[PDB]
């Protein structure tokens, strides 16, 4: 069943992260072990070798494209723009994380301005909460009744992925397997 998660031509944005449910099927990890040598396979909670003996009911598989210097922010108990407003992972996390460079599949010479992240937000998120609202975020004293203007920002901004960039800024495809 590890086909659409890995070998897919379309991945959503950080603020609209995908959520996939895989269950009631054999989940042989033969590909995982052979997934090498550009797949970081940092697993938190259980050893990568000790997976066949374990059993799980719901195997979530998140998937998005982010900057390299932000993949560190997927680790449990961390602070940052990617880990405060877009995607939150609880401290008591039991799951694996797989990240790999995807410059050849998600870059463009002009620049792929199609990946979005919410820069600023009034409150930090809760474990496993979706942020799909695109309302105007107001910080000033003047209350804008859904009217654009100063101190009434639109809290969405686009990336600047390009091939001829440094490795840190190169797009990284990250998939997180959370076991419940």
């Amino acid at each position: 069943p590890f086909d659409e998660v890995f070998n897919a031509t379309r991945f959503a944005s950080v603020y609209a992260w995908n959520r996939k449910r895989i269950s009631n099927c054999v989940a042989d990890y033969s590909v995982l072990y052979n997934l090498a040598p550009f797949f970081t396979f940092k697993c938190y909670g259980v050893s990568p070798t000790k997976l066949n003996d374990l059993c799980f009911t719901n195997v979530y598989a998140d998937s998005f494209v982010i900057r390299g210097d932000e993949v560190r922010q997927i680790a449990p108990g961390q602070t940052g723009n990617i880990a405060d407003y877009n995607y939150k992972l609880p401290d008591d996390f039991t799951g694996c994380v797989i990240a790999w460079n995807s410059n050849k599949l998600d870059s463009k010479v002009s620049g792929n301005y199609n990946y979005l992240y919410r820069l600023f937000r009034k409150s930090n998120l809760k474990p496993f909460e979706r942020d799909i609202s695109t309302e105007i975020y107001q910080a000033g004293n003047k209350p804008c009744n859904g009217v654009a203007g100063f101190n009434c920002y639109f809290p969405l901004r686009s990336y600047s992925f390009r091939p001829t960039y440094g490795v840190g800024h190169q797009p990284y495809r990250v998939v997180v397997l959370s076991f419940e």
Partner: antibody
């Protein structure tokens, strides 16, 4: 076969919302970039936005706040909701679908369906 | 912003006659512009994508090029149909906009 019907029959009174809705007749949404387009005299063909299997979208910055598209993964009643309808929006709208022979870029509008009317009086 | 000034405006022909078209980009399309067709009364349609590749379904005689300023569609066949508008399209710099087009008569 994949006729993209539009069942939303709501015409618009001044300054109210735009309660239109597209519908699907065969085809399955899956992961195509369904979108919306419009055209009228004054300003011709125009692109509002496109939606994914989730809230993945990108809106037109000429008019951005008013236009708020929705997503219906299963019941596929995705709508092009709008607020502060003017006396200028009167035009024939259209419902757009892309081709799945490419990468993450909605570029090739192929499938199309008959449009709709709106007027103020 | 991305702008197109497609020319010309006046043209007349009959079946199986010559043909010529052009598109007037401003800054840079590289190879991502497109050409479309919309007969008068029904929905639009797509003719060319990629600026050098014909799309599926389009018949044998439809092909064009592109270099941001020197686009060329070399066609000389006007079937009993296809006298309608031809629509230029471009999308590389957000947002993407179409063209206006022109016509030919009998």
């Amino acid at each position: 076969q994949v006729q993209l019907q539009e069942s939303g029959p709501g015409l618009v009174k001044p300054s109210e919302t735009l309660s239109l809705t597209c519908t699907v007749s065969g085809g399955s949404i899956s992961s195509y970039y369904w979108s919306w387009i419009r055209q009228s005299p004054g300003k011709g063909l125009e692109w509002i936005g496109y939606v994914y299997n989730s809230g993945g979208t990108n809106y037109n910055p000429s008019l951005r706040s008013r236009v708020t598209i929705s997503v219906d993964t299963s019941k596929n009643h995705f709508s092009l909701k709008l607020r502060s309808v003017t006396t200028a929006d009167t035009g024939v709208y259209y419902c757009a679908r892309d081709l799945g022979y490419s990468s993450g870029w909605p570029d090739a509008f192929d499938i199309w369906g008959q449009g709709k009317m709106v007027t103020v009086s | 912003e991305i702008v197109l000034t497609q020319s010309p405006a006046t043209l007349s022909l009959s079946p199986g006659e010559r043909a010529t078209l052009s598109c007037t980009a401003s800054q840079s399309v590289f190879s991502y512009l497109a050409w479309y067709q919309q007969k008068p009364g029904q929905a639009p349609r797509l003719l060319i994508y990629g600026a050098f590749n014909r799309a599926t379904g389009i018949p044998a005689r439809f092909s064009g090029s592109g270099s941001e300023t020197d686009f060329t569609l070399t066609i000389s066949s006007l079937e009993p149909e296809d006298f309608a508008v031809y629509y230029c399209q471009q999308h590389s710099n957000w947002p993407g906009t179409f063209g206006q087009g022109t016509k030919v008569e009998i």
